[PDB]
């Protein structure tokens, strides 16, 4: 049976580590301290959780985190006023704008994150950080903090990613599309499926790797895995208890490594997320 | 055997249309041209030969293209000062570097494309169209001339992308990897391929859909491709051969394109499409 790659545990390292250096870093230049900013638009109730679960790792950090909440009434003009806002202020170091925005007016998503300084960027989420990230310049770009939190997952297994083929289901902006130019530039061979594809079990058992990002309860079947597989589930899912996009009791008789849901990817997400904002502060001293 | 994609027949027809849609333009708004302007480092044989591919095609269309050649030791500052230049003249509908640079002086190729205006990269080589293209938002970019080209021949076949499988072989920033975000927004469920995919004759033998951007000769077999596979061959090694070994192939794709007369000419086709459409955009 697989090996559960515990998020929670990993995670928990990550964040000591990011304290440390975050301490460090004010016995270095005084009273300096990493500034978050998130916005969100609208209440959504899973908003709320994810934005609230990011303010308690922060403050376990000592990164300084603030939480914009504008109204569902709230108009696209009045999102960019507090975008340029948080661009042109220079004591805050990363920002993001919590997706989907919940409004009853139109605001144009792509528009909006667009507008946020690639420097600041530190969910990955502009064209600018994407198209760097999309065509292997990995040095000097935000990548997003779910994939990133998946390949660190990868990474734990010690199983070497080079030369695998990697299967990743879901296209999103966030997360499917952004795990797929990771593993690529990581040197899996990375095959992406999605709605649209046809034989999704007979895609699913090739990879080697499989990171699955649909939305959809359950619907990765433990017939559908690779024997050895290491699978990642990026999942959250309320249905009658939270489950992941992946069959778990099936598919840990399968895999070899396993992310388990909760606990799995979700922490490491976070994780990752703090990490970007400390580095988004280190680099703004330089 | 497979139906043979004929690149040249089918560019021309783009020329043709182009060539007609500037003429009208030019009926409707005296006075007005659409320009393109090319830059170049170096002094490389090939690049020389398809920068003067391009301009002539863009004579033919009644597009006025202007190229400016550095030598082989200017700067980056120097390379940056002409790329600014060329940002403000707003005669300038779009304009392109071509890859790779050849300099004695170490010059970051990245900082240089990504000073091009966004509103006049017509070969959508900076980060800002690339990523616009990898995410889905195919509306507000400029797609990169050899993908443009590639998605029209398969297009020819008739048969739709979506629910097939395409195989790239290839992640390139010129053809590669925008060829896999093209087919993966047309609905294919993609594979891409490098140098470290182990096993490439199996990968290849997947694809309903085959992209081989190698540089390789030959390299990719015959014998690998599936039966009935759409086959685009990328590559321009030197006779002059792709980089899928052309007899086998034809014998089991439903179709395949020729090397020469295949990708190439709608490469240059589709940067003339891009140019007319900076044009258009910046009456608007
Ligand atoms: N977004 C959040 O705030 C959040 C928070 C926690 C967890 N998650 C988890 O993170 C993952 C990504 O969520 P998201 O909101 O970014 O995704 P999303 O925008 O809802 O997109 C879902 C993706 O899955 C694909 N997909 C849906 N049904 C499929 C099916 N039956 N077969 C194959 N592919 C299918 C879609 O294909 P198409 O592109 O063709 O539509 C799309 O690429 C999910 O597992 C989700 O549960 C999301
Ligand atoms: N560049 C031009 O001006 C130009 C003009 C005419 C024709 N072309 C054609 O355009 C295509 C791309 O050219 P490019 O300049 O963009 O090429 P490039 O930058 O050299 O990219 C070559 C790609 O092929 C991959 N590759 C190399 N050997 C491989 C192997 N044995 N198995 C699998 N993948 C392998 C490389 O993998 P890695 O990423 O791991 O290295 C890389 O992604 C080629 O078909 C070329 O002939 C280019
Ligand atoms: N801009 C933006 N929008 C977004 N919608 C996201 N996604 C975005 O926040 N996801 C997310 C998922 C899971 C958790 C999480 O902490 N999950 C824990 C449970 C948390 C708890 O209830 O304590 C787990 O799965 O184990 C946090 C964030 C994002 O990262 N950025
Ligand atoms: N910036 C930039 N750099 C680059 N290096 C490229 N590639 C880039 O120009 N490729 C290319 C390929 C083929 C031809 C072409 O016309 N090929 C003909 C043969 C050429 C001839 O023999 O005259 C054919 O295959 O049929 C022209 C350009 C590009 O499109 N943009």
Same mark, same amino acid.
């Given at each position: 049976?697989?090996?559960?790659?515990?998020?929670?545990?990993?995670?928990?390292?990550?964040?000591?580590?990011?304290?440390?250096?975050?301490?460090?870093?004010?016995?270095?230049?005084?009273?300096?301290?990493?500034?978050?900013?998130?916005?969100?638009?609208?209440?959504?109730?899973?908003?709320?959780?994810?934005?609230?679960?990011?303010?308690?790792?922060?403050?376990?950090?000592?990164?300084?985190?603030?939480?914009?909440?504008?109204?569902?009434?709230?108009?696209?003009?009045?999102?960019?006023?507090?975008?340029?806002?948080?661009?042109?202020?220079?004591?805050?170091?990363?920002?993001?704008?919590?997706?989907?925005? *919940?409004?009853?007016?139109?605001?144009?998503?792509?528009?909006?994150?667009?507008?946020?300084?690639?420097?600041? *960027?530190?969910?990955?989420?502009?064209?600018?950080?994407?198209?760097?990230?999309?065509?292997?310049?990995?040095?000097?770009?935000?990548?997003?903090?779910?994939?990133?939190?998946?390949?660190?997952?990868?990474?734990?297994?010690?199983?070497?990613?080079?030369?695998?083929?990697?299967?990743?289901?879901?296209?999103?902006?966030?997360?499917?599309?952004?795990?797929? *130019?990771?593993?690529?530039?990581?040197?899996?061979?990375?095959?992406?499926?999605?709605?649209?594809?046809?034989?999704? *079990?007979?895609?699913?058992?090739?990879?080697?790797?499989?990171?699955?990002?649909?939305?959809?309860?359950?619907?990765?079947?433990?017939?559908?895995?690779?024997?050895?597989?290491?699978?990642?589930?990026?999942?959250?899912?309320?249905?009658?208890?939270?489950?992941?996009?992946?069959?778990?009791?099936?598919?840990?008789?399968?895999?070899?490594?396993?992310?388990?849901?909760?606990?799995?990817?979700?922490?490491?997400?976070?994780?990752?997320?703090?990490?970007?904002?400390?580095?988004?502060?280190?680099?703004?001293?330089?």
């Amino acid at each position: 049976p697989a090996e559960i790659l515990n998020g929670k545990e990993i995670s928990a390292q990550i964040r000591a580590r990011l304290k440390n250096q975050v301490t460090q870093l004010k016995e270095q230049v005084p009273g300096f301290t990493p500034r978050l900013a998130i916005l969100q638009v609208g209440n959504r109730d899973d908003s709320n959780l994810y934005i609230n679960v990011k303010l308690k790792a922060a403050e376990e950090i000592g990164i300084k985190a603030t939480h914009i909440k504008l109204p569902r009434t709230t108009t696209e003009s009045e999102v960019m006023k507090y975008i340029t806002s948080l661009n042109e202020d220079s004591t805050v170091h990363g920002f993001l704008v919590q997706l989907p925005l *919940d409004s009853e007016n139109s605001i144009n998503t792509e528009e909006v994150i667009n507008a946020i300084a690639p420097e600041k *960027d530190v969910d990955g989420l502009t064209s600018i950080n994407a198209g760097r990230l999309a065509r292997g310049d990995l040095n000097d770009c935000f990548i997003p903090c779910t994939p990133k939190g998946c390949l660190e997952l990868i990474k734990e297994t010690g199983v070497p990613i080079a030369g695998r083929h990697a299967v990743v289901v879901g296209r999103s902006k966030i997360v499917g599309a952004p795990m797929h *130019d990771l593993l690529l530039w990581n040197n899996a061979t990375v095959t992406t499926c999605h709605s649209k594809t046809a034989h999704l *079990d007979e895609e699913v058992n090739k990879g080697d790797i499989l990171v699955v990002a649909t939305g959809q309860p359950e619907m990765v079947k433990g017939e559908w895995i690779k024997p050895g597989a290491i699978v990642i589930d990026c999942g959250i899912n309320y249905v009658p208890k939270v489950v992941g996009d992946v069959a778990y009791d099936e598919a840990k008789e399968r895999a070899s490594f396993i992310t388990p849901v909760p606990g799995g990817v979700g922490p490491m997400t976070v994780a990752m997320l703090m990490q970007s904002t400390v580095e988004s502060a280190k680099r703004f001293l330089e």
